[PDB]
Design a protein. Structure first.
Ligand SMILES: [Cl-]
Length: 146
């Protein structure tokens, strides 16, 4: 069911936290027959430390430097992360908009720093992208602090 280049929701370690968004970079099984994936975590805005004034696109995520392995049994479903240069003009067939995210920047969880992406270099999956019949508004909003 899963292929390299797919993005998946992975069960968090604490139940009921938001699932992690992971791009599958490798798949294998161990001698026990347990199936595993390895990939890059994409962080939601509240998983990063950022200037309180920073504005986020709705559905923004950040390509992180955190990579890990998890059993394929921890997958909750598929999703898609699109590079910002394509997200506004194209959308992925067979995905609900709630499961389509946009990525403009990397975030390092080592240094708590952001950097704009110049070249998108993720593995190519079988997702099929078509031009949007309805362009998405560019809409950026900051976090709310009590
Ligand atoms: Cl920031």
């Amino acid at each position: 069911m899963y292929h390299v280049g797919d993005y998946v929701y992975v069960e968090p370690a604490e139940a009921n936290l938001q699932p992690h968004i992971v791009c599958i970079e490798r798949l294998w099984e161990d001698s026990a027959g347990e199936k595993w994936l390895y990939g890059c975590w994409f962080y939601r805005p509240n998983e990063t430390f950022h200037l309180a004034t920073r504005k986020f696109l709705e559905k923004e995520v950040f390509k992180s430097d955190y990579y890990n392995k998890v059993p394929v049994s921890k997958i909750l479903g598929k999703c898609v992360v699109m590079f910002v240069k394509e997200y506004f003009k194209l959308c992925p067939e067979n995905f609900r908009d709630e499961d389509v995210y946009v990525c403009e920047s990397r975030y390092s969880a080592k240094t708590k720093s952001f950097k704009k992406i110049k070249l998108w270099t993720m593995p190519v999956s079988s997702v099929r992208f078509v031009p949007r019949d309805v362009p998405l508004p560019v809409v950026r909003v900051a976090s709310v602090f009590a």
